């Protein structure tokens, strides 16, 4: 087991990525041919009042998968209130 991976050697400000929004990354095995796929999984599993709350949802390389940006705030949300499942997983940005 391990898990690290969350500083860099340089910084600006004293909040140099601290809190503000963090992308979110979505792994299916199916093509997703329109965007509602993934979205139509988070809203089984946050419930579906997710769709104010995130920005512009963007296609990842292979079309078998997309990604988008929530705030920290619900970035902490969104992990406690998901389960890993049958082919969507959920994955969180490196900043």
């Excluded at 969350?6 to 004293?14: E, F, I, M, N």
């Excluded at 599993?45 to 997710?50: A, F, H, K, R, T």
């Excluded at 988008?68 to 619900?74: C, L, N």
Aim: contains cysteine.
């Amino acid at each position: 087991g391990h898990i690290s991976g969350a500083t860099s050697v340089d910084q600006r400000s004293l909040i140099n990525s601290n809190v503000g929004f963090v992308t979110m990354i979505l792994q299916c095995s199916i093509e997703m041919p329109n965007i509602s796929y993934a979205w139509k999984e988070l809203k089984e599993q946050l419930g579906e009042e997710i769709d104010s709350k995130v920005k512009g949802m963007v296609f990842l390389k292979g079309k078998l998968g997309v990604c988008f940006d929530v705030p920290t705030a619900s970035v902490t949300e969104i992990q406690e209130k998901w389960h890993d499942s049958r082919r969507w997983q959920l994955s969180v940005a490196t900043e």
